[PDB]
Amino acid sequence: LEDGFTIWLTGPSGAGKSTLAYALEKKLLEKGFRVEILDGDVIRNTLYPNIGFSKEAREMHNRVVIHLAKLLSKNGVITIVSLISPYRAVREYARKEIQNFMEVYIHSPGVYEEPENPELKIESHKMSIEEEVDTVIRTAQKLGYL
Amino acid sequence: LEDGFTIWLTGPSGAGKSTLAYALEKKLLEKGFRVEILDGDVIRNTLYPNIGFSKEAREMHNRVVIHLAKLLSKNGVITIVSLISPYRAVREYARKEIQNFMEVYIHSPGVYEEPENPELKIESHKMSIEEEVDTVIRTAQKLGYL
Ligand SMILES: [Cl-]
Ligand SMILES: [Cl-]
């Protein structure tokens, strides 16, 4: 891929973000792409499991994940981020840092802060995982990322 | 590059690590490669400038830098690391984590801990920066990384 990009998953708890993230990785790998999944809880457990949940710790973790996605996306990798957070602030920061950025909002009918204008909105637990994956990939194609 | 790799600079303060790191980046970009430089102090200042200098904070920063290098190198990026530290422990951990790992020791005649068997040993200030860059690239070629 001449240009990598980030697929940033967001939605309330239970919407299916984690499942979709890993299914996207499996499919895009099968297709021959360079792909990495940045699962927030995995990264935390691997790099600083005892950092705590203070504000400063939460924003450091956010900056680390975002920087990991920025470097991976600018070097031709498809970066799938599943970073647990209800807040828009981290997602707006991520979009400012990562040039090629595709936000996937899984909508279910702190309080979850909805995005303004995500690249893709999917209704939770309606379509099969395969259809969710195909919908994300078609959006990436429409955006010129794939 | 079907396979990326890490160039890990080590040596005592003043040996010329930083100068070689940035010259290597400039040369490899001009050759058309995907390259990232992971400058330890730049990464600390960007991602967590107020983390402090405790043992836990030092080890967290080391793990972050190494994980960045690991993910970039496995995805076709030449990762040039210049992480200030006199200690072998971080370098041995990095080598265990990063499959394609090329250690470049700039030797100068809290105390610096020499590596056992680095892929390349350069005598500090003995050759021009251009010749140091060329020697690193030739070593990478000998190892089959380039
Ligand atoms: Cl495709
Ligand atoms: Cl070359």
Side-chain angles (χ1 to χ4, degrees):
Chain A
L1 257 197
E2 172 62 19
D3 311 90
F5 64 106
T6 288
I7 299 172
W8 188 284
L9 286 143
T10 185
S13 186
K17 296 184 297 292
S18 182
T19 296
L20 181 53
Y22 283 99
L24 272 168
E25 184 203 27
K26 172 176 180 218
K27 182 54 127 212
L28 289 168
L29 285 170
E30 282 172 352
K31 276 186 193 217
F33 294 103
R34 283 191 214 268
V35 193
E36 290 295 334
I37 175 163
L38 302 186
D39 179 321
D41 282 348
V42 171
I43 281 161
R44 193 193 254 280
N45 180 78
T46 294
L47 300 176
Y48 26 78
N50 313 126
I51 179 176
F53 289 85
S54 81
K55 196 202 172 8
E56 301 95 68
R58 293 175 8 234
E59 319 182 314
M60 163 182 319
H61 177 49
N62 287 350
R63 279 183 316 260
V64 168
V65 168
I66 287 169
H67 197 66
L68 255 169
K70 178 187 190 169
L71 288 195
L72 281 175
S73 299
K74 68 182 307 292
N75 282 288
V77 180
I78 304 172
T79 310
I80 302 158
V81 179
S82 189
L83 175 63
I84 296 171
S85 169
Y87 303 112
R88 73 179 63 82
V90 62
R91 312 197 303 257
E92 292 181 358
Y93 188 101
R95 182 182 291 272
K96 274 168 198 264
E97 278 299 289
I98 302 164
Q99 181 191 246
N100 294 331
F101 185 89
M102 190 187 150
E103 189 178 36
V104 175
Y105 172 30
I106 313 182
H107 168 263
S108 272
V111 160
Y112 179 75
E113 295 172 352
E114 298 199 279
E116 178 196 25
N117 184 32
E119 277 73 19
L120 176 59
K121 185 205 218 149
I122 276 167
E123 288 318 303
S124 70
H125 310 300
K126 283 331 182 143
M127 34 186 94
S128 71
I129 297 327
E130 313 94 87
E131 194 52 34
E132 295 186 346
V133 164
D134 283 356
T135 302
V136 171
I137 287 173
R138 297 200 273 281
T139 295
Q141 292 173 303
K142 183 78 127 203
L143 293 167
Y145 291 159
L146 284 183
Chain B
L1 257 199
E2 170 64 18
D3 289 288
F5 64 106
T6 288
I7 300 172
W8 188 282
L9 291 159
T10 184
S13 272
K17 294 185 299 292
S18 183
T19 299
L20 180 48
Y22 284 94
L24 272 172
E25 183 199 27
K26 177 165 190 252
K27 183 62 136 203
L28 290 167
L29 285 170
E30 290 177 344
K31 289 192 174 236
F33 295 98
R34 291 193 208 270
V35 194
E36 291 293 336
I37 168 171
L38 300 188
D39 181 322
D41 284 343
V42 168
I43 286 163
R44 212 175 191 139
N45 286 340
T46 295
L47 299 181
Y48 28 79
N50 301 309
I51 195 185
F53 289 104
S54 75
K55 181 220 222 300
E56 319 80 89
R58 284 161 191 291
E59 282 172 17
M60 186 204 321
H61 176 48
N62 289 348
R63 285 187 305 268
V64 169
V65 167
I66 287 167
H67 196 70
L68 259 165
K70 176 186 190 171
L71 291 196
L72 288 165
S73 301
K74 76 181 289 279
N75 283 288
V77 180
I78 301 171
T79 311
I80 299 160
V81 179
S82 190
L83 176 68
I84 295 168
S85 172
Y87 301 111
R88 72 177 66 84
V90 62
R91 310 197 303 256
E92 288 182 356
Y93 187 96
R95 181 181 292 271
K96 285 178 182 260
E97 280 297 296
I98 303 163
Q99 198 192 81
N100 295 331
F101 185 86
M102 189 184 147
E103 187 178 40
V104 176
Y105 173 31
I106 312 183
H107 163 263
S108 195
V111 293
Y112 181 74
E113 293 171 356
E114 294 196 281
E116 180 198 24
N117 183 32
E119 278 72 18
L120 172 58
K121 189 190 200 166
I122 297 171
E123 183 75 7
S124 177
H125 316 119
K126 197 206 226 143
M127 43 184 104
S128 68
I129 300 310
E130 298 62 48
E131 191 172 327
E132 291 182 343
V133 164
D134 285 357
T135 302
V136 169
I137 287 173
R138 290 204 282 282
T139 294
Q141 291 172 303
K142 174 187 56 72
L143 293 166
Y145 290 153
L146 277 176

mmCIF file of all heavy atoms in Angstrom, chain A residues 34-71:
data_model
loop_
_atom_site.group_PDB
_atom_site.id
_atom_site.type_symbol
_atom_site.label_atom_id
_atom_site.label_comp_id
_atom_site.label_asym_id
_atom_site.label_seq_id
_atom_site.Cartn_x
_atom_site.Cartn_y
_atom_site.Cartn_z
ATOM 1 N N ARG A 34 -0.490 -5.505 4.733
ATOM 2 C CA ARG A 34 0.138 -5.277 6.023
ATOM 3 C C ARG A 34 -0.891 -4.660 6.956
ATOM 4 O O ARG A 34 -1.468 -3.609 6.648
ATOM 5 C CB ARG A 34 1.346 -4.361 5.852
ATOM 6 C CG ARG A 34 2.573 -5.061 5.269
ATOM 7 C CD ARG A 34 3.792 -4.155 5.381
ATOM 8 N NE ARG A 34 4.747 -4.274 4.286
ATOM 9 C CZ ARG A 34 5.789 -5.096 4.287
ATOM 10 N NH1 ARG A 34 6.010 -5.933 5.288
ATOM 11 N NH2 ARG A 34 6.634 -5.074 3.261
ATOM 12 N N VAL A 35 -1.144 -5.316 8.084
ATOM 13 C CA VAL A 35 -2.201 -4.903 8.995
ATOM 14 C C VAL A 35 -1.721 -5.066 10.422
ATOM 15 O O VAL A 35 -1.050 -6.050 10.751
ATOM 16 C CB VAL A 35 -3.486 -5.734 8.804
ATOM 17 C CG1 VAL A 35 -4.636 -5.083 9.525
ATOM 18 C CG2 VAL A 35 -3.790 -5.905 7.347
ATOM 19 N N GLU A 36 -2.104 -4.124 11.278
ATOM 20 C CA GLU A 36 -1.865 -4.254 12.704
ATOM 21 C C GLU A 36 -3.106 -3.833 13.457
ATOM 22 O O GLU A 36 -3.754 -2.840 13.103
ATOM 23 C CB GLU A 36 -0.703 -3.399 13.198
ATOM 24 C CG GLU A 36 0.645 -3.862 12.741
ATOM 25 C CD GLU A 36 1.027 -5.223 13.281
ATOM 26 O OE1 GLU A 36 0.535 -5.626 14.360
ATOM 27 O OE2 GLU A 36 1.869 -5.864 12.631
ATOM 28 N N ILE A 37 -3.425 -4.563 14.519
ATOM 29 C CA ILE A 37 -4.518 -4.174 15.394
ATOM 30 C C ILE A 37 -3.894 -3.609 16.661
ATOM 31 O O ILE A 37 -2.946 -4.184 17.214
ATOM 32 C CB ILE A 37 -5.500 -5.332 15.652
ATOM 33 C CG1 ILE A 37 -6.550 -4.885 16.669
ATOM 34 C CG2 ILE A 37 -4.788 -6.589 16.116
ATOM 35 C CD1 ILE A 37 -7.773 -5.792 16.675
ATOM 36 N N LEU A 38 -4.377 -2.443 17.062
ATOM 37 C CA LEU A 38 -3.984 -1.752 18.279
ATOM 38 C C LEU A 38 -5.204 -1.832 19.199
ATOM 39 O O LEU A 38 -6.121 -1.007 19.121
ATOM 40 C CB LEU A 38 -3.577 -0.329 17.976
ATOM 41 C CG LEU A 38 -2.433 -0.114 16.987
ATOM 42 C CD1 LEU A 38 -2.095 1.387 16.960
ATOM 43 C CD2 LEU A 38 -1.201 -0.917 17.324
ATOM 44 N N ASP A 39 -5.227 -2.873 20.028
ATOM 45 C CA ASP A 39 -6.271 -3.103 21.024
ATOM 46 C C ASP A 39 -5.818 -2.415 22.309
ATOM 47 O O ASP A 39 -4.782 -2.782 22.879
ATOM 48 C CB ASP A 39 -6.444 -4.618 21.205
ATOM 49 C CG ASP A 39 -7.489 -5.001 22.240
ATOM 50 O OD1 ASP A 39 -7.592 -4.342 23.297
ATOM 51 O OD2 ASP A 39 -8.172 -6.032 22.013
ATOM 52 N N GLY A 40 -6.570 -1.407 22.747
ATOM 53 C CA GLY A 40 -6.107 -0.571 23.847
ATOM 54 C C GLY A 40 -5.746 -1.357 25.096
ATOM 55 O O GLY A 40 -4.715 -1.103 25.725
ATOM 56 N N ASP A 41 -6.588 -2.311 25.481
ATOM 57 C CA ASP A 41 -6.317 -3.041 26.716
ATOM 58 C C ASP A 41 -5.113 -3.965 26.575
ATOM 59 O O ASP A 41 -4.356 -4.131 27.534
ATOM 60 C CB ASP A 41 -7.559 -3.814 27.125
ATOM 61 C CG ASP A 41 -8.595 -2.928 27.776
ATOM 62 O OD1 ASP A 41 -8.274 -1.764 28.114
ATOM 63 O OD2 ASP A 41 -9.746 -3.372 27.903
ATOM 64 N N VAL A 42 -4.912 -4.555 25.394
ATOM 65 C CA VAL A 42 -3.733 -5.388 25.160
ATOM 66 C C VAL A 42 -2.465 -4.550 25.248
ATOM 67 O O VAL A 42 -1.477 -4.943 25.882
ATOM 68 C CB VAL A 42 -3.841 -6.100 23.796
ATOM 69 C CG1 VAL A 42 -2.515 -6.794 23.442
ATOM 70 C CG2 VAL A 42 -5.013 -7.080 23.800
ATOM 71 N N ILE A 43 -2.467 -3.392 24.589
ATOM 72 C CA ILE A 43 -1.291 -2.530 24.570
ATOM 73 C C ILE A 43 -0.941 -2.090 25.984
ATOM 74 O O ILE A 43 0.225 -2.122 26.398
ATOM 75 C CB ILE A 43 -1.555 -1.324 23.646
ATOM 76 C CG1 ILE A 43 -1.376 -1.752 22.181
ATOM 77 C CG2 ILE A 43 -0.630 -0.164 23.971
ATOM 78 C CD1 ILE A 43 -2.026 -0.829 21.195
ATOM 79 N N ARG A 44 -1.953 -1.678 26.747
ATOM 80 C CA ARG A 44 -1.754 -1.292 28.141
ATOM 81 C C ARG A 44 -1.176 -2.436 28.965
ATOM 82 O O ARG A 44 -0.203 -2.250 29.707
ATOM 83 C CB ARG A 44 -3.091 -0.821 28.712
ATOM 84 C CG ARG A 44 -3.037 -0.095 30.049
ATOM 85 C CD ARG A 44 -4.449 0.023 30.626
ATOM 86 N NE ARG A 44 -5.003 1.372 30.546
ATOM 87 C CZ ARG A 44 -4.704 2.352 31.388
ATOM 88 N NH1 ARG A 44 -3.872 2.164 32.389
ATOM 89 N NH2 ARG A 44 -5.250 3.552 31.213
ATOM 90 N N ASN A 45 -1.768 -3.631 28.857
ATOM 91 C CA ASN A 45 -1.284 -4.758 29.648
ATOM 92 C C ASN A 45 0.144 -5.121 29.272
ATOM 93 O O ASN A 45 0.922 -5.563 30.129
ATOM 94 C CB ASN A 45 -2.197 -5.979 29.477
ATOM 95 C CG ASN A 45 -1.728 -7.182 30.301
ATOM 96 O OD1 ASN A 45 -1.940 -7.238 31.513
ATOM 97 N ND2 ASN A 45 -1.119 -8.162 29.637
ATOM 98 N N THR A 46 0.507 -4.927 28.008
ATOM 99 C CA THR A 46 1.836 -5.288 27.533
ATOM 100 C C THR A 46 2.892 -4.241 27.858
ATOM 101 O O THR A 46 4.042 -4.602 28.125
ATOM 102 C CB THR A 46 1.781 -5.516 26.018
ATOM 103 O OG1 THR A 46 0.961 -6.661 25.743
ATOM 104 C CG2 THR A 46 3.173 -5.721 25.456
ATOM 105 N N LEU A 47 2.539 -2.957 27.856
ATOM 106 C CA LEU A 47 3.542 -1.905 27.954
ATOM 107 C C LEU A 47 3.592 -1.190 29.296
ATOM 108 O O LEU A 47 4.662 -0.722 29.684
ATOM 109 C CB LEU A 47 3.315 -0.865 26.852
ATOM 110 C CG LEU A 47 3.403 -1.411 25.426
ATOM 111 C CD1 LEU A 47 3.063 -0.276 24.473
ATOM 112 C CD2 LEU A 47 4.771 -1.993 25.120
ATOM 113 N N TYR A 48 2.481 -1.084 30.013
ATOM 114 C CA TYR A 48 2.469 -0.396 31.302
ATOM 115 C C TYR A 48 1.262 -0.893 32.098
ATOM 116 O O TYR A 48 0.342 -0.117 32.372
ATOM 117 C CB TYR A 48 2.435 1.139 31.140
ATOM 118 C CG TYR A 48 1.826 1.628 29.843
ATOM 119 C CD1 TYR A 48 0.447 1.651 29.669
ATOM 120 C CD2 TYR A 48 2.624 2.094 28.806
ATOM 121 C CE1 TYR A 48 -0.120 2.088 28.487
ATOM 122 C CE2 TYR A 48 2.072 2.535 27.623
ATOM 123 C CZ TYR A 48 0.696 2.534 27.468
ATOM 124 O OH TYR A 48 0.140 2.977 26.291
ATOM 125 N N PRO A 49 1.225 -2.171 32.483
ATOM 126 C CA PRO A 49 0.018 -2.702 33.149
ATOM 127 C C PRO A 49 -0.273 -2.077 34.497
ATOM 128 O O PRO A 49 -1.402 -2.198 34.985
ATOM 129 C CB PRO A 49 0.323 -4.200 33.292
ATOM 130 C CG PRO A 49 1.836 -4.271 33.344
ATOM 131 C CD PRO A 49 2.313 -3.166 32.414
ATOM 132 N N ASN A 50 0.702 -1.432 35.125
ATOM 133 C CA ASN A 50 0.528 -0.896 36.468
ATOM 134 C C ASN A 50 0.479 0.626 36.471
ATOM 135 O O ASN A 50 0.744 1.256 37.497
ATOM 136 C CB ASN A 50 1.637 -1.409 37.387
ATOM 137 C CG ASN A 50 1.854 -2.913 37.264
ATOM 138 O OD1 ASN A 50 2.969 -3.379 37.019
ATOM 139 N ND2 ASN A 50 0.775 -3.677 37.414
ATOM 140 N N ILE A 51 0.119 1.228 35.338
ATOM 141 C CA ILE A 51 0.101 2.679 35.237
ATOM 142 C C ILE A 51 -1.097 3.309 35.930
ATOM 143 O O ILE A 51 -1.034 4.491 36.288
ATOM 144 C CB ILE A 51 0.145 3.047 33.751
ATOM 145 C CG1 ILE A 51 0.112 4.556 33.557
ATOM 146 C CG2 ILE A 51 -1.035 2.438 33.004
ATOM 147 C CD1 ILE A 51 0.247 4.950 32.114
ATOM 148 N N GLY A 52 -2.175 2.567 36.142
ATOM 149 C CA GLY A 52 -3.340 3.121 36.806
ATOM 150 C C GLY A 52 -4.324 3.747 35.841
ATOM 151 O O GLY A 52 -4.191 3.667 34.617
ATOM 152 N N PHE A 53 -5.343 4.396 36.414
ATOM 153 C CA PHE A 53 -6.420 4.959 35.604
ATOM 154 C C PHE A 53 -6.655 6.436 35.900
ATOM 155 O O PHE A 53 -7.737 6.963 35.614
ATOM 156 C CB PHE A 53 -7.698 4.145 35.800
ATOM 157 C CG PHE A 53 -7.634 2.786 35.158
ATOM 158 C CD1 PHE A 53 -7.072 1.712 35.834
ATOM 159 C CD2 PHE A 53 -8.097 2.590 33.867
ATOM 160 C CE1 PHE A 53 -7.002 0.462 35.242
ATOM 161 C CE2 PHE A 53 -8.027 1.344 33.267
ATOM 162 C CZ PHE A 53 -7.477 0.278 33.955
ATOM 163 N N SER A 54 -5.647 7.114 36.438
ATOM 164 C CA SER A 54 -5.668 8.561 36.546
ATOM 165 C C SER A 54 -5.781 9.214 35.171
ATOM 166 O O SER A 54 -5.501 8.607 34.133
ATOM 167 C CB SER A 54 -4.400 9.048 37.237
ATOM 168 O OG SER A 54 -3.340 9.106 36.299
ATOM 169 N N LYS A 55 -6.185 10.485 35.184
ATOM 170 C CA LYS A 55 -6.305 11.245 33.944
ATOM 171 C C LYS A 55 -4.991 11.260 33.177
ATOM 172 O O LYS A 55 -4.958 10.967 31.979
ATOM 173 C CB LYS A 55 -6.758 12.670 34.254
ATOM 174 C CG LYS A 55 -7.295 13.439 33.055
ATOM 175 C CD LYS A 55 -7.201 14.942 33.291
ATOM 176 C CE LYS A 55 -7.558 15.742 32.042
ATOM 177 N NZ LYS A 55 -8.098 14.899 30.937
ATOM 178 N N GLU A 56 -3.894 11.601 33.854
ATOM 179 C CA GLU A 56 -2.603 11.668 33.176
ATOM 180 C C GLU A 56 -2.244 10.326 32.548
ATOM 181 O O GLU A 56 -1.679 10.274 31.449
ATOM 182 C CB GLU A 56 -1.522 12.109 34.163
ATOM 183 C CG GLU A 56 -1.797 13.467 34.804
ATOM 184 C CD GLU A 56 -2.499 13.372 36.154
ATOM 185 O OE1 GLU A 56 -1.881 12.883 37.126
ATOM 186 O OE2 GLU A 56 -3.671 13.793 36.242
ATOM 187 N N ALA A 57 -2.576 9.228 33.236
ATOM 188 C CA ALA A 57 -2.272 7.894 32.725
ATOM 189 C C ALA A 57 -3.116 7.574 31.503
ATOM 190 O O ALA A 57 -2.633 6.959 30.544
ATOM 191 C CB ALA A 57 -2.511 6.863 33.828
ATOM 192 N N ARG A 58 -4.375 8.014 31.544
ATOM 193 C CA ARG A 58 -5.330 7.784 30.431
ATOM 194 C C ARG A 58 -4.860 8.546 29.187
ATOM 195 O O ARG A 58 -4.905 7.960 28.094
ATOM 196 C CB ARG A 58 -6.743 8.203 30.845
ATOM 197 C CG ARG A 58 -7.353 7.332 31.935
ATOM 198 C CD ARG A 58 -8.703 7.837 32.409
ATOM 199 N NE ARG A 58 -9.174 8.937 31.584
ATOM 200 C CZ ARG A 58 -9.547 10.122 32.050
ATOM 201 N NH1 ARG A 58 -9.507 10.368 33.348
ATOM 202 N NH2 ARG A 58 -9.957 11.061 31.214
ATOM 203 N N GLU A 59 -4.410 9.793 29.344
ATOM 204 C CA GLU A 59 -3.988 10.546 28.168
ATOM 205 C C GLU A 59 -2.630 10.085 27.640
ATOM 206 O O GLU A 59 -2.410 10.120 26.424
ATOM 207 C CB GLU A 59 -3.991 12.047 28.457
ATOM 208 C CG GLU A 59 -5.190 12.513 29.276
ATOM 209 C CD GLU A 59 -5.189 14.011 29.508
ATOM 210 O OE1 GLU A 59 -4.124 14.560 29.860
ATOM 211 O OE2 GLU A 59 -6.257 14.641 29.323
ATOM 212 N N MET A 60 -1.759 9.601 28.528
ATOM 213 C CA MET A 60 -0.456 9.065 28.056
ATOM 214 C C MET A 60 -0.752 7.837 27.188
ATOM 215 O O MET A 60 -0.234 7.768 26.065
ATOM 216 C CB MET A 60 0.439 8.649 29.225
ATOM 217 C CG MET A 60 1.562 7.734 28.800
ATOM 218 S SD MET A 60 2.566 7.206 30.196
ATOM 219 C CE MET A 60 2.656 8.737 31.123
ATOM 220 N N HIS A 61 -1.550 6.905 27.713
ATOM 221 C CA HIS A 61 -1.961 5.725 26.962
ATOM 222 C C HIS A 61 -2.555 6.103 25.612
ATOM 223 O O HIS A 61 -2.226 5.507 24.581
ATOM 224 C CB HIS A 61 -2.976 4.962 27.797
ATOM 225 C CG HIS A 61 -3.546 3.755 27.135
ATOM 226 N ND1 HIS A 61 -2.762 2.802 26.523
ATOM 227 C CD2 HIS A 61 -4.822 3.313 27.041
ATOM 228 C CE1 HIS A 61 -3.533 1.831 26.067
ATOM 229 N NE2 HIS A 61 -4.787 2.116 26.371
ATOM 230 N N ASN A 62 -3.454 7.089 25.606
ATOM 231 C CA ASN A 62 -4.038 7.557 24.354
ATOM 232 C C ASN A 62 -2.965 8.070 23.403
ATOM 233 O O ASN A 62 -2.963 7.735 22.214
ATOM 234 C CB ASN A 62 -5.071 8.645 24.650
ATOM 235 C CG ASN A 62 -6.350 8.097 25.250
ATOM 236 O OD1 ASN A 62 -6.574 6.890 25.286
ATOM 237 N ND2 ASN A 62 -7.168 8.988 25.786
ATOM 238 N N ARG A 63 -2.041 8.887 23.904
ATOM 239 C CA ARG A 63 -0.991 9.402 23.029
ATOM 240 C C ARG A 63 -0.135 8.266 22.467
ATOM 241 O O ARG A 63 0.267 8.304 21.297
ATOM 242 C CB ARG A 63 -0.137 10.422 23.786
ATOM 243 C CG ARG A 63 -0.783 11.811 23.834
ATOM 244 C CD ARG A 63 0.071 12.884 24.524
ATOM 245 N NE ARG A 63 0.691 12.446 25.769
ATOM 246 C CZ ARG A 63 0.226 12.739 26.978
ATOM 247 N NH1 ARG A 63 -0.889 13.436 27.141
ATOM 248 N NH2 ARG A 63 0.899 12.325 28.047
ATOM 249 N N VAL A 64 0.139 7.238 23.272
ATOM 250 C CA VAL A 64 0.974 6.132 22.801
ATOM 251 C C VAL A 64 0.270 5.377 21.680
ATOM 252 O O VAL A 64 0.852 5.125 20.617
ATOM 253 C CB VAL A 64 1.342 5.205 23.975
ATOM 254 C CG1 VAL A 64 1.953 3.892 23.483
ATOM 255 C CG2 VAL A 64 2.322 5.909 24.916
ATOM 256 N N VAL A 65 -1.002 5.038 21.882
ATOM 257 C CA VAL A 65 -1.743 4.302 20.863
ATOM 258 C C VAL A 65 -1.809 5.118 19.578
ATOM 259 O O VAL A 65 -1.589 4.598 18.475
ATOM 260 C CB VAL A 65 -3.152 3.949 21.382
ATOM 261 C CG1 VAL A 65 -4.040 3.458 20.234
ATOM 262 C CG2 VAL A 65 -3.042 2.934 22.520
ATOM 263 N N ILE A 66 -2.112 6.416 19.708
ATOM 264 C CA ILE A 66 -2.255 7.270 18.533
ATOM 265 C C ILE A 66 -0.926 7.400 17.803
ATOM 266 O O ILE A 66 -0.876 7.375 16.565
ATOM 267 C CB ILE A 66 -2.828 8.640 18.939
ATOM 268 C CG1 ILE A 66 -4.314 8.463 19.286
ATOM 269 C CG2 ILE A 66 -2.671 9.654 17.827
ATOM 270 C CD1 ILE A 66 -4.996 9.632 19.941
ATOM 271 N N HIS A 67 0.173 7.541 18.546
ATOM 272 C CA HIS A 67 1.457 7.672 17.872
ATOM 273 C C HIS A 67 1.819 6.394 17.129
ATOM 274 O O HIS A 67 2.351 6.442 16.012
ATOM 275 C CB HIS A 67 2.556 8.043 18.864
ATOM 276 C CG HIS A 67 3.775 8.588 18.196
ATOM 277 N ND1 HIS A 67 3.766 9.788 17.520
ATOM 278 C CD2 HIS A 67 5.029 8.090 18.069
ATOM 279 C CE1 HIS A 67 4.966 10.012 17.011
ATOM 280 N NE2 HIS A 67 5.751 8.999 17.329
ATOM 281 N N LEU A 68 1.460 5.258 17.736
ATOM 282 C CA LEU A 68 1.694 3.923 17.127
ATOM 283 C C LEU A 68 0.913 3.851 15.810
ATOM 284 O O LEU A 68 1.488 3.373 14.811
ATOM 285 C CB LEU A 68 1.226 2.840 18.105
ATOM 286 C CG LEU A 68 2.338 2.090 18.836
ATOM 287 C CD1 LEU A 68 1.771 1.246 19.967
ATOM 288 C CD2 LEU A 68 3.131 1.223 17.871
ATOM 289 N N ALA A 69 -0.345 4.309 15.813
ATOM 290 C CA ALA A 69 -1.147 4.298 14.599
ATOM 291 C C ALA A 69 -0.607 5.288 13.567
ATOM 292 O O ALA A 69 -0.608 5.001 12.363
ATOM 293 C CB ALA A 69 -2.613 4.618 14.913
ATOM 294 N N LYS A 70 -0.153 6.466 14.016
ATOM 295 C CA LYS A 70 0.351 7.471 13.084
ATOM 296 C C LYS A 70 1.545 6.932 12.302
ATOM 297 O O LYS A 70 1.606 7.051 11.071
ATOM 298 C CB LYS A 70 0.738 8.736 13.849
ATOM 299 C CG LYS A 70 1.322 9.856 13.002
ATOM 300 C CD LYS A 70 1.830 10.981 13.897
ATOM 301 C CE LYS A 70 2.197 12.223 13.107
ATOM 302 N NZ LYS A 70 2.438 13.370 14.033
ATOM 303 N N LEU A 71 2.505 6.326 13.011
ATOM 304 C CA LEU A 71 3.731 5.852 12.377
ATOM 305 C C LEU A 71 3.442 4.662 11.465
ATOM 306 O O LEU A 71 3.994 4.568 10.366
ATOM 307 C CB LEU A 71 4.745 5.469 13.455
ATOM 308 C CG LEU A 71 5.398 6.601 14.240
ATOM 309 C CD1 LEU A 71 6.637 6.145 15.009
ATOM 310 C CD2 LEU A 71 5.790 7.778 13.365
#
